[PDB]
Structure 1
């Protein structure tokens, strides 16, 4: 009787199913959450008189219908068009070469080009109908507003590392962007994968290749699967023979089956409309004093700085520099960002060994952390590489039968070294990784592991006749703070010929290691690594109540009242009586 169903009973019209305002993940092109609030109170319609739209939504009739007769050749996977999220992946940002490179449509296309030495062609019937946009005066959703107040409460009780944790659960549930405009329509695409040596002789008749690819697309749709085709004349005999893959997907409308008139596909697009393009803005753009009137001024500029840090950390991880030229050697298959590390010679290095010590600062009673946090050399110059503090909580139970239990914490800082007539290297495996020497979390035969950063193992053998089959050279560790001195004989990268691999993200800082195997390189493409990148804190910090919030340079002060009402602006006679009881 309220909301949609009140409008839907009076009008008896469908609701438009393609709406802006939701969140958007831009590494993996998926949408998530609902940032903006959508209400159906005035019973608005599209001025066709055909759909029902919310109140803060205006549509623009496009009624456009493209129809292409030539496929387009896109040879490299580095410059990637998306066909559904092209306007939002190509924004001007620092990470424009990482957007969309963890999606379903991209990971298939990179696989089919590398494993077959192939080039791809697509041809398309696109058919845009509306453009749906949001008004500039707009209200946040009920569930998204409550999660921004919780980050503000943790920042005003001096609880960092809990506000940082709640900011990374905001990226996980609402993405990195907000879509401000969509495009309702229905596409129909065919992608083929031709052998790359079929293009190189037909450099003059490249226009004859793509003319037959768009010719075969309209035989596939118009003719039923039995061969009544009109394309097999001259070069639709090697086009069929140099191709390595073919698929046809429809995105809106009715489902596609071979042999359906393009007349009949285009008459089922009504009431089956999806978003075939979209654009938007980053997520921290919508955190400003205009959208949040209840909080003070400089407090929402501190929440918006926290969320901006969590989004940029999510792009800093899931970024793999390496070599990208396919015909060159040292080709890294997991790399999504070029480095210039191609055509670079190598030089062998000898590492003496790794060792690890612990400190055991506070928790001397009832918990002994400083036995597994220590690792000594099985057999140069060591480097420190990390200063990491490990905290653990335990439980007493004082009984008196009534009892009580108290929770302490136990700190133990550890230090992990490596030496710059030497131990061999057999790979690494962690609690989120495997060793690709064995395709399993095990060192090979003869090798023995030893812990280095409290979560991963270091496959090492001291021999020179039996473990020489799995021995791969080593290039050096570095971190987010200290680069290795092996490059520039500093910078944070591998030397030439080597490739880096992530290992052991530890509280907003990952360390890396350089190898030269060729076996760590290949395999399947890695998935995206989702936030939170930190385990939850133990609530060890005490809450410090803040009552008055001020800034010095325009003489504005916000006084929180009793009862936790709200933040009102401080009149200059009440803050005069509130600072004496404070100071």
Structure 2
């Protein structure tokens, strides 16, 4: 045809295999989408005469190299460097303590450092070879344009809750940032871990331990399968006995195997390139009146706002407070950001129960969903909390449902609205251990003897009334907090939204705009593997 293939039949050259203009998810370092365009218009080459480039980029060669002889120690896993995306993870002073905390590389480092009390160590060979950018005169792609008018067309007829669902679908396909800088090259990076007690017993030889690791790295590369290397004489015997694991990885060129020299690895560095860092801008910056020609003036300033709150919602859902200091008790694993809420003693409390009733405000006739909302108290029954309830609001939203009506041969569809709220009970002033509720396997069910019952259409947290077997798996309760109201149990919403000292928060049942939570000291809820990131959508689409 005519296009990309026309240039390769006239010059006999490869194409550069790394371009900017794509999207970039920021909290998971992975690429998707093409938010810009590139058209192989006429013909172009790099000035060295080795590649074929698109029409609007420009390259400036650097041809650098690096080789270090001493490894370095980066501690304190709450702040780290990713060695493949470093210029893009620190910019703009945004909510950046959560940034980069869900990569494939980060979750393997945190799992290693907490099991055997470890600190890490790395040594690399860089070999930078290029740097490309983009000129500021640019257009959007054909794909990104067709789905950008759609969020404007559903917004010009005044439909809130119908554009925010289309907005959160845009972050899933095109990421949060737009990378406009890259640089090709290779690397050869050899990570290592060491025990914590080894680093402290000989502090004066801190320049002598890392000097051995840089010498041992060149013996793994430059020698063959056997062991004729000279590090096994004096000091590497107290080494090689406190390291837990190590791995050598390479992100460029021919695949690495122990036995090639350093000469032969850098010889075949051409035609195998990848980005080793990048930098860009947020997504709410490329929605400009200069960028979109035909859309009107004061309408594109609202599109740039409604896509900003979606990517701000994506940052505030999957974030977790809690303690992070390793030597203290109640060390809350599965917690990325620090809170400083450690060193707090605990005091027990008491809980009453929960019973739900339906309201049915705007449903006059032909509405049958009120008895689905029903849930009674397992201790008393009807509208009589034992002694402890005092009114909070905690929730207000609408649950809709639609039905097909037969009006006759021809059918018109209509829906009905409602309103719902639940209740809760707690200890009143001072009631002794008698008439106390015991609160609750990797199952859908509670342990034996306990009985669960529904709360909010998908979750189950159990209530039980026994005093011989119920203390086998009982956990003390801390208190709910929510989107607007705060926890009244703290400070013995005028207060803040957290949990008192000695407990740990947990997420539960996000529902249409913001989520609710609870906290409970268990010691067993914290264990397990690390959770993946919670991806959008969040709000279910209204059905017109």
Q: What band does the TM-score fall into relative to the shorter chain?
A: over 0.9
Q: Which residue of 2 aligns with 1:233?
A: 233
**CA displacement at 1:355 relative to structure 2:** 2.1
Contact 1:383 1:419 in 2 (8 A): no
Tell me how large the CA RMSD over aligned residues is: 3.4
Q: Which runs of 4+ in 1 moved over 4 A?
A: 363-367, 430-437
TM-score by length of 1: 0.87
Pairwise mapping of residues 424-503 of structure 1 onto structure 2 (< 5 A)? 438-488=441-491, 490-503=495-508
Pairwise mapping of residues 525-540 of structure 1 onto structure 2 (< 5 A)? 525-539=530-544
Contact 2:438 2:470 in 1 (8 A): no
Aligned pair in 2 of structure 1 residues 444, 207: CA closer, same or farther (>3 Å)? same
SS in 1 for 2:415: strand
Contact 2:478 2:520 in 1 (8 A): yes
SS in 2 for 1:513: strand
**CA displacement at 1:410 relative to structure 2:** 2.6
SS in 2 for 1:72: coil
Aligned pair in 2 of structure 1 residues 212, 153: CA closer, same or farther (>3 Å)? same
**CA displacement at 1:451 relative to structure 2:** 1.9
Q: Distance in 2 between matches of 1:19 and 1:241?
A: 45
SS in 1 for 2:63: coil
Contact 1:476 1:513 in 2 (8 A): yes
280-289 vs 207-216, which moves further = 207-216
Contact 1:382 1:418 in 2 (8 A): no
Aligned pair in 2 of structure 1 residues 365, 8: CA closer, same or farther (>3 Å)? farther
SS in 2 for 1:383: coil
**CA displacement at 1:351 relative to structure 2:** 1.2
CA offsets, 1:80-136, max 9 Å, x none? 101010100011233110111000000000100011211111111111110110111
Q: Distance in 2 between matches of 1:431 and 1:505?
A: 35
Q: Distance in 1 between matches of 2:27 and 2:5?
A: 36
Aligned pair in 2 of structure 1 residues 480, 71: CA closer, same or farther (>3 Å)? same
**CA displacement at 1:221 relative to structure 2:** 1.1
Aligned pair in 2 of structure 1 residues 11, 431: CA closer, same or farther (>3 Å)? farther
Aligned pair in 2 of structure 1 residues 187, 146: CA closer, same or farther (>3 Å)? same
SS in 2 for 1:2: coil
Contact 1:385 1:417 in 2 (8 A): no
67-76 vs 431-440, which moves further = 431-440
Q: How many residues align?
A: 528
**CA displacement at 1:2 relative to structure 2:** 2.3
Q: Distance in 2 between matches of 1:435 and 1:335?
A: 27
Contact 1:435 1:441 in 2 (8 A): no
Q: Distance in 2 between matches of 1:451 and 1:432?
A: 23
Q: Distance in 2 between matches of 1:431 and 1:114?
A: 41
SS in 2 for 1:298: coil
Contact 2:253 2:269 in 1 (8 A): yes
Q: Distance in 2 between matches of 1:503 and 1:247?
A: 38
**CA displacement at 1:142 relative to structure 2:** 0.8
Q: Which residue of 2 aligns with 1:358?
A: 358
Aligned pair in 2 of structure 1 residues 252, 82: CA closer, same or farther (>3 Å)? same
Contact 1:349 1:473 in 2 (8 A): yes
340-349 vs 411-420, which moves further = 411-420
Q: Which residue of 2 aligns with 1:94?
A: 94
Q: Which residue of 1 aligns with 2:281?
A: 281
Aligned pair in 2 of structure 1 residues 350, 288: CA closer, same or farther (>3 Å)? same
**CA displacement at 1:498 relative to structure 2:** 0.8
**CA displacement at 1:172 relative to structure 2:** 0.3
**Structure 1 residue ranges without an equivalent (≥5):** 422-429, 540-583
TM-score by length of 2: 0.93
Q: Which residue of 1 aligns with 2:386?
A: none
Pairwise mapping of residues 202-281 of structure 1 onto structure 2 (< 5 A)? 202-281=202-281
Contact 2:323 2:332 in 1 (8 A): yes
SS in 2 for 1:292: coil
**CA displacement at 1:205 relative to structure 2:** 1.2
**CA displacement at 1:367 relative to structure 2:** 4.5
CA offsets, 1:18-68, max 9 Å, x none? 111100000101111011111111311111100111111011101011111
Aligned pair in 2 of structure 1 residues 436, 375: CA closer, same or farther (>3 Å)? closer
**CA displacement at 1:238 relative to structure 2:** 2.8
Q: Distance in 2 between matches of 1:263 and 1:436?
A: 66
445-454 vs 99-108, which moves further = 445-454
360-369 vs 85-94, which moves further = 360-369
Q: Which residue of 2 aligns with 1:391?
A: 400
Contact 1:363 1:411 in 2 (8 A): yes
Q: Distance in 2 between matches of 1:436 and 1:265?
A: 62
**CA displacement at 1:235 relative to structure 2:** 2.5
**CA displacement at 1:419 relative to structure 2:** 2.0
CA offsets, 1:327-365, max 9 Å, x none? 111211111100111111112121111222221234454
CA offsets, 1:227-257, max 9 Å, x none? 2222122221232110111111111111111
Aligned pair in 2 of structure 1 residues 289, 432: CA closer, same or farther (>3 Å)? farther
Aligned pair in 2 of structure 1 residues 477, 241: CA closer, same or farther (>3 Å)? same
Aligned pair in 2 of structure 1 residues 492, 199: CA closer, same or farther (>3 Å)? same
SS in 1 for 2:179: strand
**CA displacement at 1:225 relative to structure 2:** 2.6
Contact 1:479 1:512 in 2 (8 A): yes
CA offsets, 1:273-324, max 9 Å, x none? 0000000000111001010111111111101101101000000011111111
